[PDB]
Motif scaffolding. Structure first.
Motif, mmCIF file in Angstrom:
data_model
loop_
_atom_site.group_PDB
_atom_site.id
_atom_site.type_symbol
_atom_site.label_atom_id
_atom_site.label_comp_id
_atom_site.label_asym_id
_atom_site.label_seq_id
_atom_site.Cartn_x
_atom_site.Cartn_y
_atom_site.Cartn_z
ATOM 1 N N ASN A 192 0.854 -1.175 0.000
ATOM 2 C CA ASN A 192 0.000 0.000 0.000
ATOM 3 C C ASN A 192 0.897 1.234 0.000
ATOM 4 O O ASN A 192 1.659 1.437 0.940
ATOM 5 N N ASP A 222 0.220 4.403 0.362
ATOM 6 C CA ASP A 222 -0.020 5.345 1.446
ATOM 7 C C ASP A 222 0.649 4.855 2.727
ATOM 8 O O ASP A 222 1.271 5.632 3.430
ATOM 9 N N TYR A 223 0.519 3.565 3.042
ATOM 10 C CA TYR A 223 1.134 3.024 4.253
ATOM 11 C C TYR A 223 2.656 3.097 4.154
ATOM 12 O O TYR A 223 3.335 3.427 5.121
ATOM 13 N N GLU A 248 -2.378 4.294 14.151
ATOM 14 C CA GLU A 248 -3.404 5.275 14.455
ATOM 15 C C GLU A 248 -3.726 6.121 13.223
ATOM 16 O O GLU A 248 -4.894 6.347 12.932
ATOM 17 N N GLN A 249 -2.707 6.540 12.469
ATOM 18 C CA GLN A 249 -2.904 7.499 11.387
ATOM 19 C C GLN A 249 -3.076 6.820 10.028
ATOM 20 O O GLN A 249 -3.716 7.381 9.140
ATOM 21 N N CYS A 250 -2.495 5.631 9.831
ATOM 22 C CA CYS A 250 -2.723 4.935 8.576
ATOM 23 C C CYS A 250 -3.852 3.949 8.750
ATOM 24 O O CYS A 250 -4.932 4.191 8.239
ATOM 25 N N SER A 251 -3.593 2.848 9.468
ATOM 26 C CA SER A 251 -4.616 1.836 9.655
ATOM 27 C C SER A 251 -4.290 0.935 10.833
ATOM 28 O O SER A 251 -3.229 0.335 10.851
ATOM 29 N N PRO A 252 -5.249 0.701 11.752
ATOM 30 C CA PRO A 252 -5.125 -0.382 12.719
ATOM 31 C C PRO A 252 -4.891 -1.755 12.079
ATOM 32 O O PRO A 252 -4.304 -2.633 12.703
ATOM 33 N N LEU A 253 -5.288 -1.930 10.811
ATOM 34 C CA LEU A 253 -5.181 -3.224 10.156
ATOM 35 C C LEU A 253 -3.725 -3.662 9.975
ATOM 36 O O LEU A 253 -3.503 -4.850 9.758
ATOM 37 N N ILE A 254 -2.770 -2.712 9.974
ATOM 38 C CA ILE A 254 -1.351 -3.020 9.870
ATOM 39 C C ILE A 254 -0.933 -3.929 11.034
ATOM 40 O O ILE A 254 -0.202 -4.880 10.826
ATOM 41 N N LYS A 275 -2.307 -7.329 10.456
ATOM 42 C CA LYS A 275 -1.504 -7.966 9.424
ATOM 43 C C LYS A 275 -0.140 -8.448 9.924
ATOM 44 O O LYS A 275 0.396 -9.386 9.342
#
Length: 131
Positions: A16, A18-19, A107-113, A116
């Motif tokens: 990703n 953005d990430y 917090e700013q990109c995704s908790p899903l990281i 993962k």
């Protein structure tokens, strides 16, 4: 080659842009001399190292780690002291992500990281069971 390219191989960034862009804001290339310790058993975790080149030996007072392998995931997730030392057996080049910037990414990109990262660790356990 580029830090970008190194980050694009981390499974839990999921290619990703953005990430990856976010992480790259504080990711640093960090080089160790032969014989240097990256950390010692008992140290607080400082972040994540992705090995670019060289050979790292883990020891619990014997596992070897090479290009593409990642150090520090579990300890950054639990924030518990390292349970082994890492010593460089050659000059070692790493991409380092500070722990606080990783937490910021959650917090700013995704908790899903974070989820993962747990996934990556689970599949490794499973693969290592077979292998």
């Amino acid at each position: 080659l580029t830090v970008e390219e190194v980050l694009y191989h981390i499974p839990w960034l999921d290619k990703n842009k953005d990430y990856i862009n976010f992480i790259q804001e504080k990711a640093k290339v960090v080089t160790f001399d032969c014989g240097n310790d990256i950390f010692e058993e008992g140290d607080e975790p400082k972040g994540i190292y992705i090995i670019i080149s060289g050979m790292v030996k883990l020891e619990k007072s014997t596992d070897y780690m090479l290009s593409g392998e990642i150090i520090g995931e579990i300890n950054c997730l639990t924030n518990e002291p390292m349970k082994y030392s890492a010593t460089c057996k050659t000059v070692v080049e790493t991409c380092f992500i500070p722990k606080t910037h990783l937490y910021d990414a959650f917090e700013q990109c995704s908790p899903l990281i974070k989820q993962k990262m747990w996934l990556k660790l689970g599949l490794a356990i499973t693969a290592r069971k077979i292998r």
